[PDB]
């Protein structure tokens, strides 16, 4: 008789990237402060950056509602333009600086666990980014965040953002494997819940610093998702991927 | 100057023939002699090549795995007097196109290019095939692009244009890298730079070498590392 074993029958790990793998907030804060210099203080810039992702999320929630896709870089830029208008009394940015500020969403550094965790996961699973960011943006953050993918997948490829099912199912179709063999890895519950809806596995990566050192992150209960980890290496360990 | 290097993969980066030959023989063992299987593999690529040539002409897209499977199924019937294959082995034999081994230069050459360029696969192989070929050929990509992404094979313009749009890089800033002149000529026609990688063994010894003189394309190289060298990428 063959013992049941402990292997998990996932073929691909689909990764949300922003926040889940990348310290976007620290990048955007540092990027903006570097670009804007003495025109913005950290707290004022931090509040804009926090409002920036909220505007991006609000706009992406709105676009998902109407089944619309647009360039997420344009989403980041348009939301920044709106926020610069509300903070216009405090500081200003040129178009060139707005372009440079938007680029920060494409210069995200990864959390220290991610590059080794992604490589550690390679030994058993395909790792593919499934990001709402434009395909170029994720290709770009892959350089700044040292993300080595088997596949870069974007909402752009599917003409639809996560949580829309076509993103996960399309990613499954592209990867040539059933969604039930996809482990979705996100730091955001919406992403995993939708991936669970299409049958994919759910791995929540706790990112306590995602929204800052004092930022508020959802304390996902144990058992909500198939995996609850604070490190991609930790997820890799729980997936039978030995550390190298 | 280029911002991304767009690579054709089958042949250009991968010794698909030796891959498919050894892969088939590993599956079929002594049912089929090496020479007979080698003939099947050569006709197999031919069926794929001819099918894609036609589908390109008709602006039609099909799963390239289906193209490999269907052509293999027809080839298995044609060769069914010499050997047979179960339905499972047809799948396993067709899997060999997703197990392509790279040429010895490609892993180091791709990595050396990474330091100064985005490197992205643009293959006619289905997205799953190139992703799996990345594992077998040890191809680390910034981006994997399949004809499946665009519903159109190379050399169709929307593949290079689609790759440009996806990479966020103007075609003039994309160096197309291919072992086939058709790929680069069309990429040249979208404004992309052209690097021809000579792969004299890609069709085997009997394979005809499509002659490419110096000056036909921007780069004429015998390896990816040589292309990286000609592109200013420091060695490793």
Residue numbers in the entry:
A (entry chain B): 3 to 246
B (entry chain A): 11 to 246
Please give the exact wording used by the authors of the publication that reports this structure.
Microbial epoxide hydrolases, cis-epoxysuccinate hydrolases (CESHs), have been utilized for commercial production of enantiomerically pure L(+)- and D(−)-tartaric acids for decades. All these three CESH[L]s exhibit high sequence identity (>60%) with L-2-haloacid dehalogenases, which are members of the haloacid dehalogenase (HAD)-like superfamily. Studies have shown that both RhCESH[L] and KlCESH[L] adopt a two-step catalytic reaction mechanism by 18O-labeling studies.
